[PDB]
Design a protein around this ligand. Structure first.
Ligand code: HEM
Ligand code: HEM
Ligand SMILES: C[C@H](O)[C@H](O)[C@H]1CNc2nc(N)[nH]c(=O)c2N1
Ligand SMILES: C[C@H](O)[C@H](O)[C@H]1CNc2nc(N)[nH]c(=O)c2N1
Ligand SMILES: NC(=[NH2+])NCCC[C@H](N)C(=O)O
Ligand SMILES: NC(=[NH2+])NCCC[C@H](N)C(=O)O
Ligand SMILES: C[As](C)(=O)[O-]
Ligand SMILES: C[As](C)(=O)[O-]
Ligand SMILES: [Zn+2]
Lengths: 416, 414
């Protein structure tokens, strides 16, 4: 039959063909000899610090491609405005080596990048993104105001709104704009005398980096880290976030009264801030984005991973479960309750949150929408299926095709 | 070239060099990954009415024979030389050859070892291989299958076993076991198009009734076996109720769970896959080990397209099945899985929970990294259907590729 990947949903028995993967213009990590689909950071997208200006010839084709995408999105492909905009980009790349995006083109690409994100289960909201332009920003100090502005708008007092803030793109020879922190809001990791860690083990490096840069560290298990903002060709400056802007939620269980005594808590705004946003060849090294949490992110990964807060055993001891044997599913039982606590604690604090059931269901809807609009959707199975109750959600039964489409968010090396 | 594989829970790293030995291609390409697809659009095992190119077959045979003599530290020896010549000789003359019982036993164990989707491979070295190649009739197959079931079950102390029937032969129908598993509960399509029993077995259940089986009206009705001998319509055989050990499902604390009257058989025995060793193909080579609790309690009982008993239990547990955020589903999924472990443990039948099971797989990865420099694993199948990140495999990067000997999927006989 058709000569594109055949995709099946074993739950409903339905079939589809992904023709959108044909538009992919960037190889991934797999090969016919072996699949590397479960790898987190395959050395592919890795936008290494390319010093010398991009091959004019190359950047141009990537640029003419994005432009075409833009005019098609506005249903004016082949028109005179389109061809002129094309001539305009080619011209500016011939006399400078780079080029600039128009306001509406940035908003377009910003959304396409989210839309194209293979690992994001919340893409059904892709059409609703508040893009804040900040390509005028000229200081690590200015970078701090924008971020604070963003956190204020995105948080919206518990009624979260998706957004992204785009800072200046890269310029040949000139240093990048960077946010050293992985997220705009993260908890510190304190290395100990015994070698263990206090707080979030994930953020041990950045914490060590904030201290080596002037921050006077605290000693709690949930201290909000300061921000390290790097303007072009300058050492980064350290900025502390105003406690009022950083909204948090204490965690309690709906019926296990003792859970509140655990003193666990999490912030409301998830803001990935270390990824690179690539549009038509241009590379925006600092373009933090944020939406709203999906409960398993907190209640299973952050709170239960062996290398994170790892609270599974403490909570199981409290529920008086048999932790001396795996066949009692003590881990499964506690993990469920901890997740319920996160859901319940955000609902009570009136903060936006979505569970893995509701979430995944909406992603199925997003899949069906994209099947019609683009002929498929690039999705990373291992990442779309929730860390708990996999087959209990519909995505587990949906085969998925993963590939790279541009615009896009890519991982990028740490500035240090 | 050699993939770097990391474990994010420990921060460890390794280089899979074994993937280098892959002579077969998968579904992925640099343009896009198709690793989450269940079946190969093309990797199918097309008919064998015609013989396979003497060259192709000959190289896969030389390779297997080389592998076999390595495993017994007798490489380059005389026996090795003379065994290669025997194969050269048979191939050239009949366009095929045959395996020595010892070699077959070696293949089987390797096939299991190379199976990317099997999480129980730490046991790969302990496989009871039954040679049933001197089988000429469907009635004979039934006896073999009946003995395998008896041996495999062993009163509840399951033991891994595989039975290998005649290999495939040019212009000759394949010996085939029509059923997907040796034991499976019937799926009867009732009035409102719904289904009584096991929805996955609606088709096979209909083929049996079509060949004269007297169906029942129950959810858990042990289906009969439709064994087929070359170029001959299949035969119907009913499995002796005693040989079919079954487990009644109840709950450690929830008194009413038994009420639901659920039950499940003890012997998991895939019977529709094809075993390929050194180019030879065995269209009928059933194998069995023992269940991992999640296969029954999560997929079989809770899949929406299986017994889909998730809501019932939730209601009995008096759960807020109103909204999703009450996690009524996750809650019932756990109990049902516990009930499976409890029931099997109470009936003294072998079973392994997913935590215990994935822990042994981690070891296997280690043992294999040291023995071959890697281990082909399908992450989507190795990670349990529930409590995924709660197990260690969730945090383990894996490489997937095809090695031979190997188990493959093949077309349905009808
Ligand atoms: C509004 C609700 C949204 C939800 C519920 C959602 C949810 C998710 C989840 C569950 C993940 C994986 C988290 C993890 O495993 O670490 C993810 C990853 C991602 N999301 Fe979203 N997302 C949302 C908004 C956004 C926005 C606003 C953007 C971009 C403009 C976006 C871009 C991405 C990208 C690039 C990734 C992958 C990052 C990585 O590899 O760590 N998401 N999202
Ligand atoms: C000793 C106990 C064993 C355990 C606990 C075990 C467990 C598993 C599990 C959980 C799966 C995934 C099943 C599914 O979701 O469909 C699997 C797949 C598989 N196992 Fe095992 N296994 C065992 C023994 C064996 C034996 C004896 C063989 C072969 C000689 C074998 C060959 C395979 C293969 C080829 C697959 C993939 C089957 C498919 O594609 O449907 N396993 N095993
Ligand atoms: C090793 C494995 O790829 C890794 O643990 C992946 C699996 N799936 C995931 N899925 C999501 N959403 N987030 C993750 O961090 C991961 N980690
Ligand atoms: C579509 C998806 O590939 C499919 O549902 C897979 C996922 N993981 C699985 N894992 C195991 N162990 N067994 C299966 O049958 C599956 N099915
Ligand atoms: N819903 C989101 N936008 N998530 C972004 C990633 C959040 C990250 N997994 C965390 O637990 O903090
Ligand atoms: N442990 C095994 N031998 N599993 C074989 C596959 C069993 C199949 N998943 C079932 O539940 O019927
Ligand atoms: C409940 As706490 C110990
Ligand atoms: C057990 As209730 C119906
Ligand atoms: Zn792949």
């Amino acid at each position: 039959g058709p000569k594109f990947p055949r995709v099946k949903n074993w739950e409903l028995g339905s079939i589809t063909y992904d023709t959108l993967c044909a538009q992919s213009q960037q190889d991934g990590p797999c090969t016919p000899r072996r699949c590397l689909g479960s790898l987190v950071l395959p050395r592919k997208l890795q936008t290494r610090p390319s010093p010398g200006p991009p091959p004019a010839e190359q950047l141009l084709s990537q640029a003419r491609d994005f432009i075409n995408q833009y005019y098609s999105s506005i249903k004016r492909s082949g028109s005179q405005a389109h061809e002129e905009r094309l001539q305009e980009v080619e011209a500016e790349v011939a006399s400078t080596g780079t080029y600039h995006l128009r306001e509406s083109e940035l908003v377009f690409g910003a959304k396409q990048a989210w839309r194209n994100a293979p690992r994001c289960v919340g893409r059904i909201q892709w059409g609703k993104l508040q893009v804040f332009d900040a390509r005028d920003c000229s200081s690590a100090q200015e970078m701090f105001t924008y971020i604070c502005n963003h956190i204020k708008y995105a948080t919206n007092r518990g009624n979260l709104r998706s957004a992204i803030t785009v800072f200046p793109q890269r310029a040949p020879g000139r240093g990048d704009f960077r946010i050293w922190n992985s997220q705009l809001v993260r908890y510190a990791g304190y290395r100990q005398q015994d070698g263990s860690v206090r707080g979030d083990p994930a953020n041990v490096e950045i914490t060590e980096l904030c201290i080596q840069h002037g921050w006077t560290p605290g000693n709690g298990r949930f201290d909000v880290l300061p921000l390290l903002l790097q303007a072009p060709d300058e050492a980064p400056e350290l900025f502390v976030l105003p406690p009022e802007l950083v909204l948090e939620v204490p965690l309690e269980h709906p019926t296990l009264e003792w859970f509140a005594a655990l003193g666990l808590r999490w912030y409301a705004l998830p803001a990935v801030s270390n990824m690179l946003l690539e549009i038509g060849g241009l590379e925006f090294s600092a373009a933090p984005f944020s939406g709203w949490y999906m409960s398993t992110e907190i209640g299973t990964r952050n709170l239960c991973d062996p290398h994170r807060y790892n609270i599974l055993e403490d909570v199981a001891v409290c529920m008086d479960l048999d932790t001396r044997t795996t066949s009692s599913l003590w881990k499964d039982k506690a993990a469920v309750e901890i997740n319920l606590a996160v859901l319940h604690s955000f609902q009570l604090a009136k903060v936006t949150i979505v569970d893995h059931h509701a979430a995944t269901v909406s992603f199925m809807k997003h899949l069906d929408n994209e099947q019609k609009a683009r002929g498929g959707c690039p999705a990373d199975w291992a990442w779309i299926v929730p860390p708990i109750s996999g087959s209990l959600t519909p995505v587990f039964h949906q085969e998925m095709v993963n590939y790279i489409l541009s615009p896009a968010f890519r991982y990028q090396p740490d500035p240090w």
